[PDB]
Amino acid sequence: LLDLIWLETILPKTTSFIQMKMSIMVSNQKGLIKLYFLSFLITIMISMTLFNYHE
Amino acid sequence: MTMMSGRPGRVPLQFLPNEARSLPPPKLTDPRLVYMGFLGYCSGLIDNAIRRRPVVSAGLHRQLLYVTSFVFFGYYLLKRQDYMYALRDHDMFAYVKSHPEDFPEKDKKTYGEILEEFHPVR
Amino acid sequence: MLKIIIPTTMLLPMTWMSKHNMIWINATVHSLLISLISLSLLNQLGENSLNFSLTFFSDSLSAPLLVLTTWLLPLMLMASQSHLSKETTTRKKLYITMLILLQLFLIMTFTATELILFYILFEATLVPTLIIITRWGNQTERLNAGLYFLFYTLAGSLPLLVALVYIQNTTGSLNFLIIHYWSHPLSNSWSNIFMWLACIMAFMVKMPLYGLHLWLPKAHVEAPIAGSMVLAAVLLKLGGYGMMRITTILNPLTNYMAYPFLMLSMWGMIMTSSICLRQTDLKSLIAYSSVSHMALVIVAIMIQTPWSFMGATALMIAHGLTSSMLFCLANTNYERVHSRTMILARGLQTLLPLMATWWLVASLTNLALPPSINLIGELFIITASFSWSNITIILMGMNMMITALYSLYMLITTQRGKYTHHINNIKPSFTRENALMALHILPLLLLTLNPKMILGPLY
Amino acid sequence: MNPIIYTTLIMTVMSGTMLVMISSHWLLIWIGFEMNLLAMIPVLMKNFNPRATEAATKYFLTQATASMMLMMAIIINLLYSGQWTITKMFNPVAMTMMTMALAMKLGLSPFHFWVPEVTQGISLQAGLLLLTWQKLAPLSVLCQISQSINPNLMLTMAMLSILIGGWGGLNQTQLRKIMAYSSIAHMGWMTAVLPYNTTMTILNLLIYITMTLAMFMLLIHSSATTTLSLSHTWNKMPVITSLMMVTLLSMGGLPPLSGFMPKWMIIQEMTKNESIIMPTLMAMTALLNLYFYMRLAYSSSLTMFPSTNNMKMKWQFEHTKQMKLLPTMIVLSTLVLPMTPALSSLN
Amino acid sequence: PFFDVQKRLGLDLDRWMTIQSAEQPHKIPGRCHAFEKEWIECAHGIGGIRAEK
Amino acid sequence: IARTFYDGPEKNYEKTMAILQIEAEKAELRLKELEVRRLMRARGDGPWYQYPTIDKALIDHSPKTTPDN
Amino acid sequence: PTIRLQEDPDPEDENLYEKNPDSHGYDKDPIVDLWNMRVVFFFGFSIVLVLGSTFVAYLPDYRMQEWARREAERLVKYREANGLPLMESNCFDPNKIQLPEDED
Amino acid sequence: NVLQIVRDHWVHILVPVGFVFGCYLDRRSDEKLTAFRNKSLLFKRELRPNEEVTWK
Amino acid sequence: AKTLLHKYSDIPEGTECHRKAYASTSIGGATGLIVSAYSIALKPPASFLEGVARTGRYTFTSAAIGAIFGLTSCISAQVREKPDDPLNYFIGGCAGGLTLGARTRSYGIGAAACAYMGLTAALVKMGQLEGWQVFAEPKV
Numbered sequence A: 001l002l003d004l005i006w007l008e009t010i011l012p013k014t015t016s017f018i019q020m021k022m023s024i025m026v027s028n029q030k031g032l033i034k035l036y037f038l039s040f041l042i043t044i045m046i047s048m049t050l051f052n053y054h055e
Numbered sequence B: 001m002t003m004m005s006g007r008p009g010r011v012p013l014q015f016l017p018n019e020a021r022s023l024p025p026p027k028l029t030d031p032r033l034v035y036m037g038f039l040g041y042c043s044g045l046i047d048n049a050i051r052r053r054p055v056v057s058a059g060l061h062r063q064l065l066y067v068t069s070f071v072f073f074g075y076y077l078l079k080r081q082d083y084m085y086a087l088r089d090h091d092m093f094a095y096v097k098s099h100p101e102d103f104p105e106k107d108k109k110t111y112g113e114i115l116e117e118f119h120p121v122r
Numbered sequence C: 001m002l003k004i005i006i007p008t009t010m011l012l013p014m015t016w017m018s019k020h021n022m023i024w025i026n027a028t029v030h031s032l033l034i035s036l037i038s039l040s041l042l043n044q045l046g047e048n049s050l051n052f053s054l055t056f057f058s059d060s061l062s063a064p065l066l067v068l069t070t071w072l073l074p075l076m077l078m079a080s081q082s083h084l085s086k087e088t089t090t091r092k093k094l095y096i097t098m099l100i101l102l103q104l105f106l107i108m109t110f111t112a113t114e115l116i117l118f119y120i121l122f123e124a125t126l127v128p129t130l131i132i133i134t135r136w137g138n139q140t141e142r143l144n145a146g147l148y149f150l151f152y153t154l155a156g157s158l159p160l161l162v163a164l165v166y167i168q169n170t171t172g173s174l175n176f177l178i179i180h181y182w183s184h185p186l187s188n189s190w191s192n193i194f195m196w197l198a199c200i201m202a203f204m205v206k207m208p209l210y211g212l213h214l215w216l217p218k219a220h221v222e223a224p225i226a227g228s229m230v231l232a233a234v235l236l237k238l239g240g241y242g243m244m245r246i247t248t249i250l251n252p253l254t255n256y257m258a259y260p261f262l263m264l265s266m267w268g269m270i271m272t273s274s275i276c277l278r279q280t281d282l283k284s285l286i287a288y289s290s291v292s293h294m295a296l297v298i299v300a301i302m303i304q305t306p307w308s309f310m311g312a313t314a315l316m317i318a319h320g321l322t323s324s325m326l327f328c329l330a331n332t333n334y335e336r337v338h339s340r341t342m343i344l345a346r347g348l349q350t351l352l353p354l355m356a357t358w359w360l361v362a363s364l365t366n367l368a369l370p371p372s373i374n375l376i377g378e379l380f381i382i383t384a385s386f387s388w389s390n391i392t393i394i395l396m397g398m399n400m401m402i403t404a405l406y407s408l409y410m411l412i413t414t415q416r417g418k419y420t421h422h423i424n425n426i427k428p429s430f431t432r433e434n435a436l437m438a439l440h441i442l443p444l445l446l447l448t449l450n451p452k453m454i455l456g457p458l459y
Numbered sequence D: 001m002n003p004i005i006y007t008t009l010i011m012t013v014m015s016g017t018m019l020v021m022i023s024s025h026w027l028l029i030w031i032g033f034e035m036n037l038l039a040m041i042p043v044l045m046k047n048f049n050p051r052a053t054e055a056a057t058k059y060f061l062t063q064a065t066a067s068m069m070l071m072m073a074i075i076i077n078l079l080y081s082g083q084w085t086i087t088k089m090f091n092p093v094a095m096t097m098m099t100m101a102l103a104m105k106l107g108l109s110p111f112h113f114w115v116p117e118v119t120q121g122i123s124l125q126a127g128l129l130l131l132t133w134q135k136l137a138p139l140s141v142l143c144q145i146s147q148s149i150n151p152n153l154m155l156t157m158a159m160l161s162i163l164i165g166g167w168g169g170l171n172q173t174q175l176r177k178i179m180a181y182s183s184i185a186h187m188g189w190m191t192a193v194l195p196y197n198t199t200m201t202i203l204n205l206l207i208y209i210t211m212t213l214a215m216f217m218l219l220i221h222s223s224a225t226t227t228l229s230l231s232h233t234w235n236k237m238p239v240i241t242s243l244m245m246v247t248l249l250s251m252g253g254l255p256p257l258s259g260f261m262p263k264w265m266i267i268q269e270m271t272k273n274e275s276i277i278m279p280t281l282m283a284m285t286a287l288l289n290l291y292f293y294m295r296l297a298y299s300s301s302l303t304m305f306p307s308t309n310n311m312k313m314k315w316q317f318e319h320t321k322q323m324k325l326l327p328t329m330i331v332l333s334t335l336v337l338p339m340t341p342a343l344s345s346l347n
Numbered sequence E: 001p002f003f004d005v006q007k008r009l010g011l012d013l014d015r016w017m018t019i020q021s022a023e024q025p026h027k028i029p030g031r032c033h034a035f036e037k038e039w040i041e042c043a044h045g046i047g048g049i050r051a052e053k
Numbered sequence F: 001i002a003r004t005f006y007d008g009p010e011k012n013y014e015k016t017m018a019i020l021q022i023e024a025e026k027a028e029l030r031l032k033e034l035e036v037r038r039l040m041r042a043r044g045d046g047p048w049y050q051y052p053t054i055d056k057a058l059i060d061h062s063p064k065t066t067p068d069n
Numbered sequence G: 001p002t003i004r005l006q007e008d009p010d011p012e013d014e015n016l017y018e019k020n021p022d023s024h025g026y027d028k029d030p031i032v033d034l035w036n037m038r039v040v041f042f043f044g045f046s047i048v049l050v051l052g053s054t055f056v057a058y059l060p061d062y063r064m065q066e067w068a069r070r071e072a073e074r075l076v077k078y079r080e081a082n083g084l085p086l087m088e089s090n091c092f093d094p095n096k097i098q099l100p101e102d103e104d
Numbered sequence H: 001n002v003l004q005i006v007r008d009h010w011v012h013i014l015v016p017v018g019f020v021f022g023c024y025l026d027r028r029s030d031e032k033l034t035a036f037r038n039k040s041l042l043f044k045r046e047l048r049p050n051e052e053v054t055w056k
Numbered sequence I: 001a002k003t004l005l006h007k008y009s010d011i012p013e014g015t016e017c018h019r020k021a022y023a024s025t026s027i028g029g030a031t032g033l034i035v036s037a038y039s040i041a042l043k044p045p046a047s048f049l050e051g052v053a054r055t056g057r058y059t060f061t062s063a064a065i066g067a068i069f070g071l072t073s074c075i076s077a078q079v080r081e082k083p084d085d086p087l088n089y090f091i092g093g094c095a096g097g098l099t100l101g102a103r104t105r106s107y108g109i110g111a112a113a114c115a116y117m118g119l120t121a122a123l124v125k126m127g128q129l130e131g132w133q134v135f136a137e138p139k140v
Ligand SMILES: CCCCCCCCCCCCCCCCCC(=O)OC[C@H](COP(=O)([O-])OCC(O)COP(=O)([O-])OC[C@@H](COC(=O)CCCCCCCCCCCCCCCCC)OC(=O)CCCCCCCCCCCCCCCCC)OC(=O)CCCCCCCCCCCCCCCCC
Pocket: A038, A042, A044, A045, A048, I029, I033, I034, I036, I037, I038, I040, I041, I044, I045, I046, I047, I048, I049, I050, I051, I052, I055
């Protein structure tokens, strides 16, 4: 219950699962430049509003 | 973020100013030079290994050139590094001397007259 | 101190320029000679340490650990040459090179004056161990074991590095002598609490503390014999030594920051001893016994008393010797029958009597029979803990019972009863194996005659 | 491509970078960037195929958008101060636009999307050039305007680059995409310390370039672009796989290897500025890069994968072309930690 | 980063075009020649940090 | 054994004193160096953090077709 | 082929006793084996254990324990010859301590 | 007769030479830490009529 | 914008719980809108109505988390009469994590989020109290 299951569950297995899910989310881009450049426009607007308005 | 590039009187691409000649040059048995020569020797051994040659015996002239090049570059590298550290300390001392109000000399108390809190271990 | 370091470095070209059939002989002879030379560091002063230079210094805490490392190298070489016989010449030399590099890093780690140098060598010890485990381990799990061995350590040690550099920005130095003389109390603040955690958790992971210990059974079980020997005998102690150095800047915070770790150590000591009672794998039992002994060491370091520090030093040395011997004993039977299941090969006292005697002596030192130094350390720690709080005896005594219960259990399972009928390839013990057991056991017994030599600076 | 034309194009790329790094006028820096891009496009398409054409098109679109933004920032700065000298931007809006343009040129998150694809679409030599030489000019410009950069935006982009590099590299079996995600993470590390100390940025750049050159040369030597192709190298050139494993350990930043020296120097520097949370997160995130380096080392050198029969024929032939600087590159990528104080020569 | 070749060699590749008060053809003045001249002479040699204040 | 393999306590004692002096001087130098860096970066009156301005020798001090500069 | 791969079968482990009935378990070559046994026994049991134990046993008293006993004897003699207390609760002389003047 | 045995046994002096070299380097390192030789308040002493240093 | 952060932080800890909850709701809604914008850009929803639905889902989830966190933390601060205590932020963050788990209808996500958000919020409170800097200015 403790060594083989829950101590595994909390520290190492949770870390592995979270990193794998984040890796899948980050790397699954279809390679279409339309989506990338739309995200670029969103980023440029955000940087102009949230950092450039605060100085 | 750029500390010493704009230091006054600095020539752009000298690598070794004239004033650096006022410093004692590193000895040829400097342990850092010996480590640089060791790096050159390791480069020669790896060059033998990659080319599928007898690692220790194949190129004695080539291994010698590796060691000599590493030592030759390391000498001037050590000279420049020592000069830069000497400049850092020179500027630090001059600035402390020119700003006495920012680095005051305060009277120091003895331990018999400083009250330190005692924390028992139990 | 260079009189130890330079011969160890010279071991590398010596093994790389030796004849194909001379590597083991040369390495063993010269590692034994290096151990003899290192034996001169045991002359310690009392008042202060032996400060060889700005970089290296020797203490009554460092010297026994250094001697144990230099003594463990020849035993590892002796234990490795049997299962590495079929290996090529180049890979055998590479294995010996890994062992030599590990010894060099450990020797420099135990004598570094400055905490960043200690940290760098402390991390450098990781690479040879990882290569040994993942290249010369036998099973497919070794790879996973390697990962567990790596990221548990780094996830603890990366914060420590940050703390260390932070300290040098405010104190101005990380030299241990300066740190000790100019030490100042830690106030009660959240920043101080997190700096305490960053300073402690890496050594906690290395011990390992109960709850952060899952890497140890994997790594010790999947490793080859020399890997297991060095992992249990020396590498774990890297935590303890580290703690004994860094608690000098953590007062008086440790007065209350230590409660969760003390609770974890005592309860998990009970837990791991109990785990040893139901274990099918013989190496796993030894690994969990190491976890329990290291929990006792953690308690000793956390309560911060001279008796506890002395007990922790003695227990570290004694456990290193005993656990290395137990791993070698298990490996002899593994090489006999190619399985680590404890109940497969039974009644071995009938077939291997002298090895049975070795098993018995190792089991006796594991359960801390007087007047062995195992019990000297254990009793000192228990007395200090009783002074800390009288209820601790309840847990401590319980641990003692369970320890004996599993130790003899192992002894009864593998040595007594009747032999397994179908196992007919159990050859007589080789002189190499008997000599390895003797070279483990005799120094341990001789240390009883001069216990102070392992009792540490607080003696 | 004709070898003379190839040499001319390479020297034009280098000349654009040198023009960027020797100019005091914003227009000449812009011209250097244009010249670099113009000569760089054909180098990506040297080996003609649909993938190379797609990679070149994506690269050109990204860099041309970045160049438009950069010229816009220059013009805004000129409008609010009749200045052409690259000292310190006088308008914060112009500074934000310039920082975004330079981040897009470097491939820092969230403008990292193009870096893997392009690196996958070109040859290994083109990838070597793209991941080593193409970083010099924007980083030099960033170093020159370091005092003007807003720390929040730059640090946000750096942390995002480290996180995304680790996470994206975790998912890759192709070696060029692994190198690209490694590059993104290292760029984040470089740009994190830029507002505090440009010498640390230069040191990290040099170390990363050395290790990247070593890895690309080792991958060209053992002509492998996938993990499974690299798993055959032990049965033909074991020394190459051993050197690759050591270099991979160095890239992960493990001490006593060289790759540890930049991070060690950066975290420490950040602690001089009362920055603890960001260095702690940065190291704990670089653990991911170490993980996928370790996985590659497992598949390549620490274990032995099954091979093929025809490999026997390859046993009878040597490598025709020899790399002169590969041994020096490997030694510099691994054994230079004891020479750390020499970094003072970089300021 | 900035390899300052021009000052080392005294070449003047692009410095003739950086400021409004620098040697225009036929001595045609900029609209703000006096102001830029005053600001440049104020800020010369004291560093950017001191010049900003 | 003492005559053959070891020295007297004075050697270790005074070597410790020399080592401690060097280490303490390095610590105070490091603290002073950090303070000097902070002051120079804040005020800009030292040799460090000297960021370039426009060279005044680029100004043309000749009549400009118009009396008012 | 009902098979997945071309592989060598796993070989059986060979007994060093078969070709060398007195094989010491060090090496396949009998001469190397005998000399490895001899060097291990001589340099571990004869050199390190015995001579090292003798060396450690006769280490000079740098911990200064007999010195401390003699110093304690001198102090006890002097103090009980003159009626002084055998030990003082104050480790440092109060006359060189400067306490804060006011505690309220 | 000694040529070949030397050629196959010269690796046996590497570690003893390492030990001797390490001792020499320890002495050299000792030479750099004499700033307080015969200057500590506890061990300061008048020189003998013939000795030049109290330790080396 | 850090103006919303100031609007949240200008009001004292255990006072005006409704206004604290409103400010935190605004911050959460802004975060959810940014998340939905990036998600729609990088993963198109193949329909306009489905994109509007996804934006509403993300923004409502984030705004609900913000409201729950702010209201719970302010109420815990005023009832216990202990402002400047990180455990109020821990309770608020763990309630927000439970809200996230309920919104995604996952017990495991709920527990993990409760723990992690509580610890993060307590850490933010400690950083506010001790002056920890995320984006440190270049002092040296
Ligand atoms: C100096 C630096 C600054 C530079 C920037 C300055 C810019 C100034 C000029 C702006 C004027 C623009 C003039 C010409 C632009 C050319 C556009 C174009 O060619 O379209 C091609 C593009 C692709 O054309 P296509 O491939 O032939 O057609 C494919 C089908 O359309 C699609 O086929 P499907 O059925 O397969 O797809 C399903 C459907 C799916 O459609 C959707 O899912 C979108 C619906 C989302 C619902 C939003 C929630 C509603 C409430 C939000 C309000 C926020 C406050 C509320 C507070 C709480 C409320 C209680 O369509 C999509 O997937 C398209 C997704 C892209 C939507 C718009 C992209 C913007 C960023 C993405 C976030 C979207 C909003 C999320 C919420 C964020 C906050 C608003 O067309 C479109 O994507 C849609 C039409 C675009 C027309 C409007 C463009 C104007 C917006 C420009 C920027 C906005 C302001 C900038 C800054 C303002 C402040 C400073």
